[PDB]
Amino acid sequence: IRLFLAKLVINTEEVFRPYAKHWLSPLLQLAASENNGGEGIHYMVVEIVATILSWTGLATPTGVPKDEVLANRLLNFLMKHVFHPKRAVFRHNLEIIKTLVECWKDCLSIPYRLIFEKFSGKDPNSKDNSVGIQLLGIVMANDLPPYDPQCGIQSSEYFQALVNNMSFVRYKEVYAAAAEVLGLILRYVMERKNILEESLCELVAKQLKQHQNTMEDKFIVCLNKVTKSFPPLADRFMNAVFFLLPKFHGVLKTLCLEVVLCRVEGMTELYFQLKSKDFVQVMRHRDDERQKVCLDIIYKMMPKLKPVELRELLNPVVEFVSHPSTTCREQMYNILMWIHDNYRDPESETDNDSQEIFKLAKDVLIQGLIDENPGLQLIIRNFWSHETRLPSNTLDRLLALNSLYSPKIEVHFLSLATNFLLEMTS
């Protein structure tokens, strides 16, 4: 009769919301009773938790400690039974747990050592710790660091079991997500100050050093995963990836370009290393995103390079006005924006190269007005109609407008002329 009384108030919640503050306690007391049938009558149970967080903002389960320990029992059973070997609903289960732990936040009282038993699986042949590290990602992606030794166990054994799970290499997603959540852990370490993970960084560097000597392909991708959220570990393996840049011909090469994209601001000169590793050979490749990220690192290394190699650098990048994926051409226009904005050379003339780069900058930036995509050319129009590039008294503008002639574009030049004329109409 309690089950039958459940699936009427489950259907009539629209009646209840003006006086719903009292109809949370009995539903919670129903939820915490282990007489449901099986492992909690999941479908009914998720309907219970959905309708009980329907009235969020009023009558939180904290304020009466009976309600607090009741919700703690719910949280414990949810963290206990989650697995469900059909994979299609596992993500839904983690979604329910994630919503509960992100909405409650008041009776925190979170459990440990069962998480530790979840990821504490030995025998690196089976994925029996995927659940523990994924719920670690659930508990970690918002808040809640592993504050172990208040009632738990020692954190040293905790974290070394965790990096052993990161050392577990038989299946893929286990070490991938483990390295990711370690990166989030280290991000919380660098955000805080009191945490003495200042040997855990040495421990994980030791683990990647021990995996480095015998394995190479998994090493760079777990380095990519830990540098997804953790920059300053790349001071260690900076010369290792610079050494074995080749023989990684694939997406691994993009991973190398990403991890060198992590640290550019804070290297010495960086150019001759890449030039010895024939970086300009692979800048002329055909995959989009490696070209995007190497244009990104060219923008990164830009305002420190000498103007002598910049002339050689500006040769293959002008070959990128004939390709789709407007973000890559957008950054390709951005580097020309900066090089014109600060390398116009107002009567310096240290070379023909130092003004020749400004000449080619003017050439490709003016030619970039007839591209077959809107928006970007609107931004170019805003950049040229920006103040103190074409003056704006009235006719200083007119005696200026002929100078941006560029006979590669003349088909639309008169339309652009009246556009830049009567854009300042009043």
Q: Closest by alpha carbon to 424, among 404, 383, 394?
A: 394
> Resolution, in Å, please?
4.3
Experimental method: cryo-EM
Pairwise CA distance, residues 96 & 107, whole Å: 17
Q: What is the DSSP letter of 153?
A: -
Q: How far is CA 157 from CA 57, 186, 371, in A?
A: 40, 17, 59
Q: Which helix (H) or strand (E) segment is 127 a member of?
A: none
Pairwise CA distance, residues 89 & 82, whole Å: 10
Pairwise CA distance, residues 373 & 358, whole Å: 25
Token pair of 358 as six digits: 């400004």
Token pair of 201 as six digits: 């960084």
Pairwise CA distance, residues 418 & 415, whole Å: 5
DSSP characters for 255-300? Answer: HHHHHHHHS-TT-S--HHHHHHTTHHHHHT-S-HHHHHHHHHHHHH
Token pair of 261 as six digits: 């994209």
Write b or e for each residue in 345-382: b if 16 or more Cβ atoms lie within 10 A of its Cβ, otherwise e.
Answer: eeeeeeeeebbebeebbbebbbebbebeeeebeeebee
Contact 59, 20 (CB under 8 A): yes
Neighbours of 281 (CB within 10 A): 9
Pairwise CA distance, residues 421 & 415, whole Å: 10
3-state DSSP assignment of residue 192: coil
Q: How far is CA 381 from CA 204, 350, 365, 395, 416, in A?
A: 50, 31, 11, 19, 9
Q: Is 278 left (phi over 0), alpha (psi -120 to 50) or beta?
A: left
- Please, what is the angle between helix 353-367 and helix 326-342, to 10°? 140
Q: Closest by alpha carbon to 42, among 85, 92, 4, 76?
A: 92
